[PDB]
Scaffold this active site. Structure first.
Site, PDB file in Angstrom:
ATOM      1  CG  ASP A  30     -13.103   3.924  41.622  1.00 61.02           C
ATOM      2  OD1 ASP A  30     -13.125   3.523  42.802  1.00 61.02           O
ATOM      3  OD2 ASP A  30     -12.445   4.926  41.269  1.00 61.02           O
TER       4      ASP A  30
ATOM      5  CB  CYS B 168     -19.954  32.668  33.562  1.00 63.21           C
ATOM      6  SG  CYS B 168     -18.492  31.691  33.157  1.00 63.21           S
TER       7      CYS B 168
ATOM      8  CG  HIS C  20     -16.229  27.925  34.115  1.00 62.69           C
ATOM      9  ND1 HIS C  20     -17.298  28.387  33.374  1.00 62.69           N
ATOM     10  CD2 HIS C  20     -15.323  27.489  33.209  1.00 62.69           C
ATOM     11  CE1 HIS C  20     -17.035  28.250  32.091  1.00 62.69           C
ATOM     12  NE2 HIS C  20     -15.832  27.700  31.960  1.00 62.69           N
TER      13      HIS C  20
ATOM     14  CB  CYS D 160     -21.636  28.381  35.595  1.00 64.40           C
ATOM     15  SG  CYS D 160     -20.074  29.257  35.768  1.00 64.40           S
TER      16      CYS D 160
ATOM     17  CG  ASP E  73     -14.952   8.402  35.260  1.00 66.72           C
ATOM     18  OD1 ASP E  73     -15.109   7.388  34.543  1.00 66.72           O
ATOM     19  OD2 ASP E  73     -13.870   8.620  35.854  1.00 66.72           O
TER      20      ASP E  73
ATOM     21  CB  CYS F 161     -20.546  29.682  30.734  1.00 62.09           C
ATOM     22  SG  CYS F 161     -20.676  28.685  32.235  1.00 62.09           S
TER      23      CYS F 161
HETATM   24 ZN   LIG Z   1     -19.188  29.532  33.694  1.00 57.22          ZN
END
Ligand SMILES: [Zn+2]
Ligand SMILES: CNc1nc2cc3nc[nH]c(=O)c3cc2[nH]1
Ligand SMILES: CNc1nc2cc3nc[nH]c(=O)c3cc2[nH]1
Ligand SMILES: [Zn+2]
Lengths: 358, 358
Positions: free
Chosen positions: A92, A299, A325, A296, A256, A294
């Site tokens: 930015d 998880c 996460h 990820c 963003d 999820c």
């Molecule tokens: Zn997750």
């Protein structure tokens, strides 16, 4: 790879999915950019950021221009080398987080269009934001117009400072930012001025500053079609998952926000069933992962109960896990959005998403 | 794997190198145990802890008996499952961090030998510490003797509480702790009592409580030979790299300390050239890694300068990187120690280490 090439692969209504190709990598659009505040995406190693699916991150200019300073980072090899992220970075202008004059801003130090562009160069930014003025909300039409006109003058200054540095011009891209508050005619005049100057991309500025979602969407409705169709559209500082879905439905390609990182650290976890606050005692013995679907790593291996404990105890691993996460969730959201547009079922995705999320 | 089997592969003087085999894995000795305070090795994922080379960690009992509570962790599947560390865990008794009576201690709650052993069971500890009294330093001979005698009585209570729980007895090990302050005759009587009771391992307690390195080594000189040769020797709460090297030279097999994690978070990095404080301005543009020879991931990818910035800025990634480096350093130290003993050149290693470190 080219310096910059945006190609649209599929459309549904105003929504688009495609790619931005840059020297340091490819960016899948619609894109979410995790935020790096002071040369770090807070509580995550860059390889973790990448692992969640991010193609590009946003580097805040304001803190780094302070310490270590743009010049020192340049001396050390630039932001990419310093922080260990070798993919594109959008920087930015540093002005949003910051005595106002036509020259620029002085603060407790002077920041002008030229200096801003120079700092982004020293950092080695791939996508450079023109230096603008984000009009406060609400704004009278006169004030909004004065602010917008100044921003367009600073946009031209930005363009010329960028172009007057050959290595920057050759290797990076420049985005212009639309202003005009909530007034259609000012938004149009601003779109007109920016297109006349010409940029690699166009951000919709001036939103997500307190007007609320209905008003933001109403402004997006008329403002995004005013921007060149064939370039990326960036909605600065947005936002909540539902904000992102509606903004894509209105033609935005890039986003963003600090919500997933910052609110992660504060205990807020995003789930397809809506956000949860993991500190709530209801999770103290909940062995389920943060979210049922999820993919990820967090998880895959840890329970709500453990993360509940960690955050309650003030432990750094709690910040680490919540943040990984949440950024992974945001990336999965963008993937679903890209896939649904590509398959011509984004409108249905949007409805299904909202029904469950709420 | 057996419940517990300690085998010595090589010796040099008083120093030993070997393995402890347990159901959940093998422990290379001499061993350093990273400290988990409240079900986390602060700022590190367990896979990161393992990656640095740790074979076992120490879980503090005190905070977890508070929240979430031993019973809740047991309900959730035990500490290993909760925190995601599937290798051995040594749990302390919780008494060191804590109204004193022969029954145990009450505090702002009553902790006795029996309750301590029960809590360590609920947590699912692989190596359980008998509940003792760490005599303050300095101590008069009378006070040291009274304290030591109480500890030996509590040691017998520990043994019987452990043995009266079949799943604990069958699957975990129990270590006894030697007391006696700095008095050889008390240390001998304590070694005698513990051996008569019989334990899987013997810790040297009562040190690293302000007596300073010379005095600690003088006590170790006579105290460690009093313990059974054929079982592991654990020096609780030690320590600095030089402390560890001298303690191995005197027969210690196991160590724990918060120095690498805690001091990492505070800016202190261990190097073969001695510790450095990364916040010092001398590192602001130092592109070298924390240590020239270290094989850790942090030293492979980030500079002093970046970590300097991170810690100065209060960023969580600074804590993460410093801690990973420091624990990796400690593990590399133990590896060098094991290798040098195995090769019969540990005395030379110790001299070379000290020469450069200082
Ligand atoms: Zn997750
Ligand atoms: C979180 N909301 C929000 N963050 C923003 C950043 C911005 N930067 C430059 N110009 C803007 O108009 C602008 C608007 C913004 N709204
Ligand atoms: C950091 N120094 C230190 N940490 C200790 C922990 C202990 N636990 C049980 N018993 C001890 O004698 C004992 C001594 C200790 N010294
Ligand atoms: Zn290292």
């Amino acid at each position: 790879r080219p310096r910059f090439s945006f190609s649209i692969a599929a459309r549904e209504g105003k929504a688009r999915t495609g790619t931005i190709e840059m020297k340091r990598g490819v960016i899948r659009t619609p894109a979410f950019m995790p935020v790096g505040t002071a040369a770090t995406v807070k509580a995550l190693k860059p390889e973790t950021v990448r692992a969640t699916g991010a193609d590009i991150i946003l580097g805040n200019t304001y803190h780094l221009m302070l310490r270590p300073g743009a010049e020192r980072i340049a001396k050390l090899g630039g932001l990419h080398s310093f922080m260990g992220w070798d993919r594109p970075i959008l920087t930015d202008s540093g002005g949003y987080q910051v005595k106002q004059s036509e020259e620029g801003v002085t603060f407790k130090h002077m920041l002008s269009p030229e200096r801003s562009i120079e700092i982004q160069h020293l950092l080695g930014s791939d996508i450079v934001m023109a230096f603008d003025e984000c009009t406060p909300y609400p704004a009278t039409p006169s004030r909004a117009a004065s602010s917008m006109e100044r921003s367009m003058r600073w946009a031209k200054r930005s363009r010329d400072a960028f172009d007057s540095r050959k290595e920057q011009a050759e290797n990076a891209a420049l985005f212009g930012i639309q202003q005009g508050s909530v007034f259609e005619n000012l938004r149009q005049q601003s779109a007109d001025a920016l297109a006349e100057i010409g940029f690699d991309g166009y951000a919709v500025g001036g939103l997500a500053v307190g007007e609320g979602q209905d008003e933001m969407f109403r402004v997006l409705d008329f403002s995004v079609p005013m921007l060149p169709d064939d370039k990326p559209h960036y909605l600065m500082g947005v936002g909540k998952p539902d904000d992102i879905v509606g903004a894509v439905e209105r033609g935005i390609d890039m986003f963003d926000c600090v919500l997933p990182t910052r609110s992660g650290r504060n205990g807020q976890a995003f789930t397809w069933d809506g956000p949860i606050n993991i500190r709530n005692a209801r999770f103290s013995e909940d062995l389920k992962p943060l979210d049922s679907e999820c993919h990820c790593a967090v998880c895959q291996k840890w329970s709500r109960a453990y993360i509940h404990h960690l955050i309650r105890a003030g432990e750094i691993l709690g910040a680490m896990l919540m943040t990984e996460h949440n950024i992974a969730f945001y990336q999965q959201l963008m993937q679903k959005i890209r896939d649904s547009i590509s398959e011509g079922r984004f409108s249905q995705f949007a409805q299904d998403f909202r029904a469950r999320y709420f």
